[PDB]
Design a protein around this ligand. Structure first.
Ligand SMILES: CC(=O)N[C@H]1[C@H]([C@H](O)[C@H](O)CO)O[C@@](OC[C@H]2O[C@@H](O)[C@H](O)[C@@H](O)[C@H]2O)(C(=O)O)C[C@@H]1O
Ligand SMILES: CC(=O)N[C@H]1[C@H]([C@H](O)[C@H](O)CO)O[C@@](OC[C@H]2O[C@@H](O)[C@H](O)[C@@H](O)[C@H]2O)(C(=O)O)C[C@@H]1O
Ligand SMILES: CC(=O)N[C@H]1[C@H]([C@H](O)[C@H](O)CO)O[C@@](OC[C@H]2O[C@@H](O)[C@H](O)[C@@H](O)[C@H]2O)(C(=O)O)C[C@@H]1O
Lengths: 471, 486, 481
């Protein structure tokens, strides 16, 4: 009696031709499980900003005085609409361009470049209520130029970058609301703010205008930035309205990653792929957790499950008509294999090797790399943002189809592999016994001679032979 | 007396390919490529486009007198525009951040024009300024929605003007800066020389100076008019200050959106049909995974594929009058005379001939084929995309990115689609082959000794087999008091 | 006897279920061979710049004098950091766009538009050490440095109505001094401007004087901009100081736009439909792995080392349990076909291939290979793009994209082989099993079915009777016992 396996499972798979097919064993290849924690990345923590925007951090807004500030990070954590940036109303040129820069960094380090002390001939105590530190008229920590007395000589300030690393320098211009607030502030009138490097050349003038009030002020500050190379000097020259640096940022990077909008908090675990909902210690080719991962991640997919069949049709008591065919049922009373007698370890190991290989081919072929996914855009980059979105929308489709289908096409194939293995085991046995048995038709052979147990192992050996001279 | 196994054949000439063969006539087939529109442009999800005809978005908003009698709905889903509309900036000039402005307006949950800075309140300045370029029936005019502030008398007092946005929606606002050809034209129009046009909101700041210059004449003029725009927030004020050269807004636009869509470059006209997917040639009412109508869709569309046909086989090999060597194998032919199923019996008898389909397996197989077709169709995720994008003369790189991309998806989809058919087709045929082979076998292990197996899928009974005994064979009930002859 | 073919092959394929499976024949469908040469593309040369940048070329840096300069090109060859560019320190507005534009050109032509000589009242021979020609201060061949004449600098005016019948590339520049003093020395006037206007252009520039680091000897800089002047359209220059004027223009007609190949090599007069920085690819296969930065009509770039499709059967010197099953071995001695017969006889032994099925199967395998190759659509793409320091986001989009197509194509390609390979082997297995069956239902009783794919006749079988079995003509007066 040849037969096949059947257990207490009720896992269901789908094949190209049938669905809701109950199978003995099955493997899922859709990661759908995070862990709600935010982690280091390949050993390197994010940059946690709580409720500071990169802008408020670098400028040194009084409200970011106490922030983590790790010297090296893999990505950045930032709350969707942080609240704490330019406490002095204004704006920031090429902002996003800069955030994609600081998203990931090999080494960061503040340094003093244009000391507050050295701008004699110029007031430096300038400040604003809006940038007040506990009922005190302060200002941006890292910034610094008003008239001293009734005079405003030109301002010159310079810095040959000797720090052995490229440096991020930030500066700005004051836009008053009034020609009276102008002379009351810089005495002169047709004023400019000039910067210069080996690769940068910029001459902004202020733009005076009536404006609505914000954090108390009708006036704004407009900041810009740049990347002074090593051994390159920068230059400043202004006849009024220059907000100067005092500090630069020695920045050595890296690989460039991306920012993660998130509420949570670093938790001191470890992952290779991190999502807004949590990390994902996984090895599957696909996942459906959240679109906005950072790291080396499986491919996002619009499924709920991708169940692969590994075992056979579970039939307690096809394409080759043996399983659920002429062998009408599975034996729940066979446990040491998938096919056997009344198990056969030759074919079982073969088909165990078979399925294993399959499940490996699906997985180990899926090449994956460190992407960032979530990008940063401004109000005049909607077009650009959508473009990104059409693409990720577009690979979403391509991957979801190849995956729903891969599974259905390989599931009907796996079901046939088994059918055919049971079919060939019944055939291996047919052409050993031959005349010495009645072939019943349920996959059973009745012995026309007397068959003891040694005679039973020979048939399992493939050794039956064959001194029968009986009707 | 005898019984024969066989399969179906019909008058079909439909051809499929498979991985191994080509031009293979089959009994049935489903093509899964959409290639039919209705040549009509329609509402999208129940919502009309914005029909501009030969107006540009710029001409529309500024109120070029040539756009006076336009449709103007309160809410639209996409925008219809010709390829080079003509009626735009009747007065030569330009429009900052124009492309962004259209992606913005490309879809709108609600639009509304509202007078914010009444033309009349600008005392001290002349306001009736107009031009031949913006001619209305011979008479010099100007943009319906703008105000040309010029000197009054010999005087141009500093011009101030506010609007606190109370409208309860975000408001689109536009303005312009006039650029003369001539210090003389500049003194004539504004009297003052060192002029500026300042504009500020809560997040805006922009002091513009007029760029006077000699330039070629356009529509009659060397001067130009440079427009910019902004979104004023709720409860936010906008401030205009000018000592000369300001083209002020008389109106604003309450705008609430929505989800953002795109602009369909066409010649046609809305026709009051309905659709979930629109193309420039016509709308697509379809349910298939792939289409090849036109690359520039808007809506929820099938994947665009560079194929002429995608015929999936549903029936068997048509062989009138494989992997399991049954169909086209030892059963050499199909029975055009067996019409109630895919696989069945013959049976010859001294009570008569007659075909008969094995209904059990014909059903098993119909279900399975239905599922295959549905698998190919139903696993196809489809989202709302606009496809056609808008780009400037200095964005040829950025344009060519969008192209290289939509191009790459053309290649993926086409390969996969074409291959997906060939594969599932070599499988469809084997499926039917196996189905037959197994019917044959079921009968063979029933009759065994009591018949001669001819080898053409036929069984010659050694004993007499009446109709009741024939049915037992189809039943699976053959059993089994036979003996003769031998 | 029924049997199948075996040969001295050691080629291995994988399939979904097995690996390292020696087969009789195989086709690898991955292109991985160039010719190490850079070539014309569809019959049209690149533009060879050597160590010149596009900027250095157009402005006419004296160090770019003796360049190739063809009238029509298909792509552009440039080193990675050319050196010969803006010999006079400065910059170039919208530079990257300008190169995508010039990256392919149906027709180019330099034409003198504002003859250097006509600028009376201004000094014109202005030059510099930075743009040195053999010790002597010079300047861009294609530009004109308008400086004061005497102690006077009259307002400078200049037009060109574009009659050339083609669109014309025009460039100019604004000088930026270090010093109000250098500014009075060179132009005498202080509140200066450089105005330029066409039918769609407008741009009044002011010179940004400033203290800056010295470069090539200078703190001053020269900022260049450009435009496309239309047919029958005029361009107007107006300056009260600081204009670097064009003496020449460029008639340009294009075409289709291509891209720039960053290489060290040099054009070699071969031909190709597909060029890579390592060499050109004359190929016909769907996938390749040579180098990601192609230009032309290329196979899909795939991160694989090999893609071996199986064409023949399992080499044995399956799913239907025939090959490597009850027919335990292959016959290295059967060379005229994939599957055939043995036949032992008192007239002799001898192999023989069943030609009918060997042919059926060859056709089917040919088609498989062609299906994999011929359904692959392929368009002209440039792949390598051009980006500025403030476009790192935009650059990283292009990358994340070409990266995603790397993943898709690699997966599909690798898997596509493994699948069609577990099928190719079954195909052959079935082909055999069925040959065996055809013979078994012919002989039936008249032989003993050994079970190794062999048949022992109970009767005498001569050569004519053997052929009847191969024919399908066995029939059938036997008896014996
Ligand atoms: C350097 C300096 O002058 N700091 C002042 C500051 C500046 O004058 C102001 O930021 C210019 O833009 O003004 C501060 O007062 C703000 C307050 O001043 C009143 O005059 C005005 O009527 C109020 O509306 C409001 O603007 C400031 O905090 O910014 C004081 C600071 O010392
Ligand atoms: C408000 C106003 O002054 N409108 C004038 C207009 C302006 O002077 C012009 O738009 C300034 O840019 O001039 C109009 O005349 C056009 C015509 O004027 C001649 O003097 C000149 O020789 C011509 O080249 C041409 O500009 C106009 O239509 O623009 C009349 C209009 O009333
Ligand atoms: C038209 C002209 O004046 N050409 C000069 C050139 C320019 O004046 C200079 O670029 C102004 O920006 O100066 C040249 O000399 C450069 C050299 O001059 C020394 O006086 C100075 O102290 C040095 O630092 C250095 O700039 C030049 O080659 O650029 C000479 C040229 O004839």
């Amino acid at each position: 009696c040849i037969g096949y396996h059947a257990n207490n499972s009720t896992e269901k798979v789908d094949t190209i031709l049938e669905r809701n097919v109950t199978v003995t064993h099955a493997k899922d290849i859709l990661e759908k499980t995070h862990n709600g924690k935010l982690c280091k990345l390949n050993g390197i923590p994010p940059l946690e900003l709580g409720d500071c925007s990169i802008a408020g951090w670098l400028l040194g807004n009084p409200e970011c005085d106490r922030l983590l500030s790790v010297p090296e990070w893999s990505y950045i954590m930032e709350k969707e609409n942080p609240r704490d940036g330019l406490c002095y109303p204004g704006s920031f040129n090429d902002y996003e361009e800069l955030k994609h820069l600081l998203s990931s960094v090999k080494h960061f380090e503040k340094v003093k470049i244009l000391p507050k002390d050295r701008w004699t001939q110029h007031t430096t105590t300038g400040g604003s209520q809006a940038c007040a530190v506990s009922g005190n008229p302060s200002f941006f920590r890292n910034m610094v130029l008003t008239k001293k007395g009734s005079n405003y000589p030109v301002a010159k300030g310079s810095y040959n970058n000797t720090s052995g690393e490229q440096m991020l320098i930030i500066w700005g211009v004051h836009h008053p609301i009034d020609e009276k607030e102008q002379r009351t502030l810089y005495q002169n009138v047709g004023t400019y703010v000039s910067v210069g490097t080996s690769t940068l050349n910029k001459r902004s003038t202020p733009e005076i205008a009536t404006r609505p009030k914000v954090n108390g002020l009708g006036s704004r500050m407009e900041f810009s930035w740049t990347l002074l190379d090593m051994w390159d000097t920068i230059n400043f020259e202004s006849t009024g309205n220059l907000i100067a640096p005092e500090y630069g940022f020695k920045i050595s990077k890296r690989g460039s990653s991306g920012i993660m909008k998130t509420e949570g908090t670093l938790e001191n675990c470890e992952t290779k792929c991190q999502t807004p909902l949590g990390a994902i210690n996984t090895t599957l080719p696909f996942h459906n957790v959240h679109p906005l991962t950072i790291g080396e991640c499986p491919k996002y997919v619009k499924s709920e499950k991708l169940v692969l069949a590994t075992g056979l049709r579970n039939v307690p008591q096809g394409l080759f008509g043996a399983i659920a065919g002429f062998i009408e049922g599975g034996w729940q009373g066979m446990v040491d294999g998938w096919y056997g007698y009344h198990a056969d370890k030759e074919s079982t190991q073969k088909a165990f090797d078979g399925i294993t290989n399959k499940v490996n081919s699906v997985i180990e072929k899926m090449n994956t790399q460190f992407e960032a996914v979530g990008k940063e855009f401004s109000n005049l980059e909607r077009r650009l943002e959508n473009l990104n979105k059409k693409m990720e929308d577009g690979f979403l489709d391509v991957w979801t189809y190849n995956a729903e289908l891969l599974v259905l096409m390989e599931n009907e194939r796996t079901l046939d592999f088994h059918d055919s293995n049971v079919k060939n085991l019944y055939d291996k046995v047919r052409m050993q016994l031959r005349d010495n048995v009645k072939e019943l038709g349920n996959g059973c052979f009745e012995f026309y001679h007397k068959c003891d147990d040694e005679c039973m192992n020979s048939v399992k050996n493939g050794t039956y032979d064959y001194p029968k001279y009986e009707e």
